[PDB]
């Protein structure tokens, strides 16, 4: 069971967004419910609504009723949540989630319960600011970043907007010892973060180290080689 969502976007206040969630192995669209829940950065969760694809019937939280539509396309096993008249407060990671249904013998209806699988989430930022790609600067390994048989090196991922970025090292081949720090929103209105990795210092003359950054909101990918300091 796998739920794959559309990518992160920046949207202007007053616009609409449509987020997709595709299920792949359908049991899901035939026997389950699909819900949308959002999470503002640094906070908890709000259910927006859900649908039972085989019936086409959808319920929504009062606070979104009139402004949100959830649909589901059984031939593409894809569900969608369209949210209109976007406001700053709609900035959040939007998750689709699947769960089973139970029958309510008093309502005479199938109802949503717990969610058993969640998709990876889609960060939608509502802002009048335009998207901007990051610039990558090296954090070159040197005598001042080595200890014992270990060296630290990294990537400064500077001046992008909005979140998120994905940072990988060597196309995802290097994962051990990596720390990618949380971004800070700078006075300029742009984000920055560093990503660092510790490696054997004995590797520096022979192993290539590339920082790979993907910034979906500006449709940019950047790769930067990080080489040891040479005097």
């Amino acid at each position: 069971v796998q739920l794959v969502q559309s990518g992160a976007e920046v949207k202007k206040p007053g616009s609409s967004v449509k987020v997709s969630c595709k299920a792949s192995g359908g049991d899901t669209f035939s026997n389950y419910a699909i819900s949308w829940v959002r999470q503002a950065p640094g906070q908890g969760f709000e259910w927006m609504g859900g649908i039972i694809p085989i019936f086409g019937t959808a319920n929504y939280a009062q606070k979104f009723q009139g402004r949100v539509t959830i649909t589901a396309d059984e031939s593409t096993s894809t569900a969608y949540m369209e949210l209109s008249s976007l406001r700053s407060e709609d900035t959040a990671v939007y998750y689709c989630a699947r769960g089973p249904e139970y029958y309510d013998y008093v309502w005479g209806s199938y109802r949503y319960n717990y969610f058993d699988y969640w998709g990876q989430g889609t960060l939608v930022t509502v802002s009048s600011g335009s998207a901007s790609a990051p610039t990558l600067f090296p954090l070159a390994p040197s005598s001042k970043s080595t200890s014992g048989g270990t060296a630290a090196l990294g990537c400064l991922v500077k001046d992008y907007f909005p979140e998120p970025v994905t940072v990988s090292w060597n196309s995802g081949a290097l994962t051990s010892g990596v720390h990618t720090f949380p971004a800070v929103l700078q006075s300029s209105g742009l984000y920055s973060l560093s990503s660092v990795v510790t490696v054997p210092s004995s590797s520096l003359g022979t192993q290539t180290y590339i920082c790979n950054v993907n910034h979906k909101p500006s449709n940019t990918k950047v790769d930067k080689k990080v080489e040891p300091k040479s005097c």
Partner: protein, 220 residues
Amino acid sequence: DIVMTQSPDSLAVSLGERATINCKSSQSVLYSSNNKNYLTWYQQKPGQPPKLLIYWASTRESGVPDRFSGSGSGTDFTLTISSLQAEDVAVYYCQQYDNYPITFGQGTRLEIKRTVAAPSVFIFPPSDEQLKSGTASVVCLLNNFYPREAKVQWKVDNALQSGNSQESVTEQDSKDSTYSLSSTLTLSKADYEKHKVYACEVTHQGLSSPVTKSFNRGEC
């Protein structure tokens, strides 16, 4: 609407010991038709979606380790993690589905205790590429320490800096229960080139006295 309130907001527990998280609902979430509490627990790690642990208050989801247990009824619920493991570092959330709208508690962060670990301290001058652009970012890295408290001070030509650095800390790492921190000092190119000696001074419980890492601008 049902308000879900978790307690405590954060806890730190020793490995192999018991962690207890509470959740209280503003009204009963006991569904009479089948006499089940419509109360669920989820685990969320950073950058990751939530994962189901327990439903109907006390039924474990298939694949979930038996050290996870749920109990309670009506309005008062507990998630108990026995024999706590490193991989249990996460934020835990309760959720009700008795009443529409479905509602969630605000999360409880669980962190783990461990022995003191001093940071390894590293420094990075700004790149020549960045300086060409008019700005200098100088980065001081405090790698793999515990506990999270540390003092980090920049000195530029021996003058303590104020208001021009920014600190970011990672969430606790499952592999060794440590934190890492980046301190970035930002200067204009013109200010960066007025001074020579750049230093970051780190004080931590694991260091018998504060550690300074420094460089001289322009030097090997």
